[PDB]
């Protein structure tokens, strides 16, 4: 809690039901406590890591989402001044557009708790099973249910962090159709504050990322002789490397 608090010291947030910062930190602790308790087996070999990186994902994600919520709120406010200047038959329906204006407050209510789920997916879920992910999500959602944070009930990790332009780009390279494989690719790309470890039997992934970075893609393996030097050349001139 001491560490969590100082990491979310930066305060994007606004008043909620119930404290707001105090709630967020208590969730993440109760999630980390539930993650290792359900998933990991063996007696107390492993300890807090994902927790730090889960907080770091949230900070990067709230900042990215609150600045984009305020950007779309600015896009409907600039359209409000332009329709009022004009006032004719259809334009008064457009003015009515307070349904959207009313909608924004409800959208902003859930963005803090939506970022909680998105960060947890990026950090805790990467190596979990189709069923293992879904089941933890429920424990997270019911934790979000106990605490007075609002989340989107009809929420989908893919649609929330993937853009249709990127989702097309990935498949074009040759990523598989599956939801599981989409989430995985999203987890790899979206957050790169840390090096990703891709595990796939069929090295079909080693080509996917190659198609995406093209010429820039320089391939190495920890086993080759020239590895020691070839990485130093890859780092010096911005080469995208897969090991």
């Amino acid at each position: 809690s001491q560490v969590a608090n100082n990491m979310v010291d930066v305060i994007p947030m606004e008043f909620t039901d119930f404290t707001i910062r105090d709630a967020v930190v208590n969730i993440l602790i109760h999630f980390d406590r539930n993650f290792y308790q359900k998933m990991k087996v063996g007696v107390n070999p492993r300890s807090p890591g994902y927790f730090i990186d889960g907080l770091r994902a949230l900070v990067k994600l709230v900042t990215a989402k609150y600045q984009d919520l305020q950007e779309n709120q600015r896009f409907v406010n600039v359209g409000l001044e332009k329709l009022n200047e004009s006032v004719k038959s259809l334009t008064f329906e457009k003015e009515r557009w307070l349904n959207t204006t009313k909608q924004f407050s409800k959208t902003s209510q859930e963005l803090i708790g939506n970022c909680i789920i998105s960060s947890i997916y990026e950090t805790y879920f990467g190596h979990l099973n189709e069923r293992e992910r879904a089941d933890m999500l429920v424990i997270l959602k019911r934790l979000l249910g106990k605490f007075a944070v609002k989340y989107d009930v009809n929420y989908r990790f893919i649609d929330y962090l993937v853009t249709l332009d990127e989702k097309m780009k990935w498949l074009e390279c040759g990523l598989d159709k599956n939801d599981y494989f989409l989430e995985n690719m999203s987890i790899v790309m979206n957050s790169q504050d840390a090096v990703p470890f891709l595990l796939d039997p069929s090295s079909h992934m080693i080509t996917v990322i190659s198609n995406y970075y093209g010429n820039k893609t320089v391939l190495l393996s920890f086993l080759e002789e020239g590895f020691v030097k070839r990485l130093e050349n890859a780092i010096r001139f911005g080469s995208v490397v897969i090991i």
């Binding site: 001491q2 990491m7 107390n44 070999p45 492993r46 300890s47 890591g49 730090i52 920890f222």
Partner: protein, 275 residues
């Protein structure tokens, strides 16, 4: 074999007798200290066995560790109240018997034991919270080894960590209750003539960073073996040889951080043993 539990009590009386030449006002307190130290030993040996954890292994060397750990605090501390000395004794008792303890059920067991022992041999109402978190002793703030204020220490670390953050490798962290207690633990270790501490920290706890820090406070060259998949024993030998030659023939004062990853073969660890 081991002696008596009644010879041990007697032998360390003579040990306390010698060190209480420096606090003559408590010359009458040597016997109940010697009896308490032995009691603490007998109990730790009994409560924490190799059945729970393999490293739970106690011997009169602990006693000797404690008795000397007590002297060094006195020989370089403020003139001492009885409330000082028992807390001085209690600090060493914690670092000698309980730092090795895993988890919390056993760690709290010792807190109660330490309380139980003082009450049985040194009956005072002047004691405070005897938990390790509450007794913090240092020579970072004072010129004499003295119990320091929690508020005074945290701020002192904060001003020195920024400096260490600026001067050395740039990595920001949150300085917290555990970390202050641990900074002093490494500090005492790195101060003693032979200073060897092995830290058991899971990962990302920060054990490697604190070590670099406290070494920097003590003014130690931080050597970290540059090993890799294609490192030979000869490489590590060279790393070791230099660090040794610099320590005697250049008077260097190096702190060698060895991670578990660095021991690549049996021999690498054997080299560390010989050292």
């Amino acid at each position: 074999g081991y002696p008596s539990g009644k010879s041990l009590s007697q032998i360390y009386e003579i040990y306390y007798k010698a060190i209480f030449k420096l606090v003559p006002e408590f010359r009458s307190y040597t016997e109940p200290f010697a009896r308490a130290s032995v009691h603490l030993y007998n109990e730790c040996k009994a409560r924490y066995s190799t059945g729970l954890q393999s490293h739970y292994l106690f011997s009169p060397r602990e006693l000797t560790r404690l008795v000397r750990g007590v002297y060094t605090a006195i020989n370089t501390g403020p003139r001492q109240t009885l409330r000082s000395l028992i807390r001085l004794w209690a600090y060493e008792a914690w670092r000698i018997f309980a730092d090795r303890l895993v988890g919390v059920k056993e760690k709290n067991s010792f807190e109660q034991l330490l309380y139980e022992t003082v009450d049985k041999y040194l009956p005072n109402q002047d004691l405070g919270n005897i938990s390790s978190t509450s007794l913090l002793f240092s020579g970072l703030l004072s010129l004499d080894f003295k119990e320091v204020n929690k508020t005074d220490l945290v701020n002192f670390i904060e001003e020195r960590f920024k400096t260490f953050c600026d001067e050395e490798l740039e990595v920001p962290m949150v300085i917290h209750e555990s970390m202050v207690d641990h900074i002093l633990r490494i500090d005492r270790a790195l101060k003693q003539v032979q200073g060897h501490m092995m830290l058991i920290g899971a990962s990302r706890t920060g054990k490697t960073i604190l070590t670099r820090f406290v070494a920097w406070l003590n003014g130690l060259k931080i050597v970290q073996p540059k090993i890799h998949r294609h490192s030979n024993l000869s490489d590590f030998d060279m790393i070791l040889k230099k660090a040794i030659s610099d320590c005697s023939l250049k008077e260097s004062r190096t702190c060698l951080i060895i991670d578990e990853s660095n021991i690549l073969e049996t021999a690498f660890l054997e080299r560390m043993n010989t050292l």
